[PDB]
C-alpha cells in the first residue's frame, strides 16, 4: 500500500548510463569520442536515426574548454559541409549535470574508413576536395581554426555529401589581435601537423588547416598517409624527406632560433618530385597539392585561392560558397577560466535545448 509505481530504467550501454530520455530510443554503441561513448539512436521526432555523443568533461579544465568551444562554435555555424548540433541533452540543474549529450546527423561513413577499403575515382577525389575547402572557407571566414583536419573527421554519406566534424580542437583567433605566443602548442594529429607547429611554437595561423588538407589530398591519391612520422622529430623528418631541405629564404623566416639551429644541423635533402610519388595522379591535382604542402606558411595557398584552382573548375562557384555572417571576435577566446565557471558557461549555452525553454 504505496503506489507501486514502476517506471525505472535509464537505458544502459556497456554498463554506463546513456540517458537520452524518451525522445531517443533503440541505442547502438558506435565507438568512442574524446570524453565518452557515442551511440546511434532513433529520433522519435524527426523519424531518423542520429548520432549521440556522451561527454563528461567536468573534472578537467581542458575538457571543459574543448567542450565549450565545440558547443559555441557549432551552434553558431550553419553550413552544408560542417556537422550541426541538432539537440543537446543534460540535467535540469547544474549540480545534477555530470554529463552532456550532443545529438548530430548520422553519417554512414567517413573518409578514413573509405580510404581503408577504396581506391577513389578521380571524380571522387575532386568532389571530396571541393567540399573540404568549401566548408573550410566558411570556418576560416569565421576566424576559426579547426586544428585537426584528417580523414576520420570528414563524415560521408552515400550521396557523397561530405561534412567536417570534431571541433573539440578548434579555436577562434581574431586577427585584430596578435596571437604570437598565445596559441596552444601541440595541436593537430601528428601525421597532419604543419611544420610550423613544431617549428614556430605557439605562432601558427589558420594555414595549418591548409597543410592538413594537403596531407588529406595526398592520402586520397594513394591510400597511404604521406607523412607517417613516429614522433615530432620524425614527423619533421618525413616532411623534409619529400619537400627537401628548406630554402635559404624559407629558413630565414623561421622565427624560433632553436628551430633554425636544428634545421641547419640536418644533412641536405633533395625535393622528391610530386609525380615521382604520384605517377598516376592528375597533374593539376599535383599542382594544387604542391601549393598546399608548401613548407613556408606565408607562401602556402589560402582557402579562397584553392577553390579557384584549375583542378576544382567543375564545381567552383563563389556565389555558392558562403562565409560566416557574424565572424567570432577576441572576447569569445577568453576561456582560460576555472573548471567550475566553464561548467556554468556550458550550462548557460545548453539551456536553449531544455524541455519547455521559451525563446
Amino acid at each position: 500500500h504505496a503506489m507501486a509505481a514502476a517506471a525505472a530504467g535509464p537505458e544502459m550501454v556497456r554498463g554506463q548510463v546513456f540517458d537520452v530520455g524518451p525522445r531517443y530510443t533503440n541505442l547502438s554503441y558506435i565507438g568512442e569520442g574524446a570524453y565518452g561513448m557515442v551511440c546511434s539512436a532513433y529520433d522519435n521526432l524527426n523519424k531518423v536515426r542520429v548520432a549521440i555523443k556522451k561527454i563528461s568533461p567536468f573534472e578537467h579544465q581542458t575538457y571543459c574548454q574543448r567542450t565549450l568551444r565545440e558547443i559555441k562554435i557549432l551552434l553558431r555555424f550553419r553550413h552544408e559541409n560542417i556537422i550541426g548540433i541538432n539537440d543537446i541533452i543534460r540535467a535540469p540543474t547544474i549540480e545534477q549535470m555530470k554529463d552532456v549529450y550532443i545529438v548530430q546527423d548520422l553519417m554512414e561513413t567517413d573518409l578514413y574508413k573509405l580510404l581503408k577499403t577504396q581506391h577513389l575515382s578521380n571524380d571522387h577525389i575532386c568532389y571530396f576536395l571541393y567540399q573540404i575547402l568549401r566548408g573550410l572557407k566558411y570556418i576560416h571566414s569565421a576566424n576559426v581554426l579547426h586544428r585537426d583536419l584528417k580523414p576520420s573527421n570528414l563524415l560521408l554519406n552515400t550521396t557523397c555529401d561530405l561534412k567536417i566534424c570534431d571541433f573539440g580542437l578548434a579555436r577562434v583567433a581574431d586577427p585584430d589581435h596578435d596571437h604570437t605566443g598565445f596559441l596552444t602548442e601541440y595541436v593537430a594529429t601528428r601525421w597532419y601537423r604543419a611544420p610550423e607547429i613544431m617549428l614556430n611554437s605557439k605562432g601558427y595561423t589558420k594555414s595549418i588547416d591548409i597543410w592538413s588538407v594537403g596531407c588529406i589530398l595526398a592520402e586520397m591519391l594513394s591510400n597511404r598517409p604521406i607523412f607517417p612520422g613516429k614522433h615530432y622529430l620524425d614527423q619533421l623528418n618525413h616532411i623534409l624527406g619529400i619537400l627537401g631541405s628548406p630554402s635559404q629564404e624559407d629558413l630565414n623566416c623561421i622565427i624560433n632560433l632553436k628551430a633554425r639551429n636544428y634545421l641547419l644541423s640536418l644533412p641536405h635533402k633533395n625535393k622528391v618530385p610530386w609525380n615521382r610519388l604520384f605517377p598516376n595522379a592528375d597533374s593539376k591535382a599535383l599542382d594544387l597539392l604542391d601549393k598546399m604542402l608548401t613548407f613556408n606558411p606565408h607562401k602556402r595557398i589560402e582557402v579562397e585561392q584553392a577553390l579557384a584552382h584549375p583542378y576544382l573548375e567543375q564545381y567552383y562557384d563563389p556565389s555558392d560558397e558562403p562565409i560566416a555572417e557574424a565572424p567570432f571576435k577576441f572576447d569569445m577566446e577568453l576561456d582560460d577560466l576555472p573548471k567550475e565557471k566553464l561548467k556554468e558557461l556550458i550550462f548557460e549555452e545548453t539551456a536553449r535545448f531544455q524541455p519547455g525553454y521559451r525563446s
Binding site: 602548442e185 613516429k230 622529430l233 628551430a259
Partner: protein
C-alpha cells in the same frame, strides 16, 4: 624474430601479447628501424602496465632513439603523469636533450602542463 613482434605489440596496448613474448625470451631492448625500443612505444601511448613489466625485464630506461628521444620525452609530450613518475623512480635522466635541444622539462613548459612540471622538479 621476436623483437619485431614485441615492438609491434608494445605499440598496440597489447598487455598480454607483450607478457607472452617476454616469456618466449623476446629481447626487451629490441630496436626498431629508428632506434625506438618497446619502452619508448609503451610510454608514448600511456600503456602503464606494459611500461612496468618492460622495466622489470630489464628495459633500458634511458634509451635514445636516432633523434635523441627518450622514453621520458615521450611520456612527457602526451602528459602521461603516472608513467613519468615510474620512469623517474627507475632513474631516467631528467636532463636528457633530444637533438632539437628539448628536455622533458622544456616540453612541460612548452605545453603549459603545470602538473608535469612539479613532477619533474621533485
Amino acid at each position: 624474430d621476436l623483437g619485431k613482434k614485441l615492438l609491434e605489440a608494445a605499440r598496440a596496448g597489447q598487455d598480454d601479447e607483450v607478457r607472452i613474448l617476454m616469456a618466449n625470451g623476446a629481447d626487451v631492448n629490441a630496436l626498431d628501424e629508428d632506434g625506438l625500443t618497446p619502452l619508448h612505444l609503451a610510454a608514448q601511448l600511456g600503456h602503464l602496465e606494459i611500461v612496468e613489466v618492460l622495466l622489470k625485464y630489464g628495459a633500458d630506461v634511458n634509451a635514445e632513439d636516432n633523434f635523441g628521444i627518450t622514453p621520458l620525452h615521450l611520456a612527457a609530450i602526451r602528459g602521461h603523469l603516472e608513467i613519468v613518475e615510474v620512469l623517474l623512480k627507475h632513474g631516467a635522466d631528467v636532463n636528457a636533450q633530444d637533438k632539437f635541444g628539448k628536455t622533458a622539462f622544456d616540453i612541460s613548459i612548452d605545453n603549459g602542463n603545470e602538473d608535469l612540471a612539479e613532477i619533474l622538479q621533485k
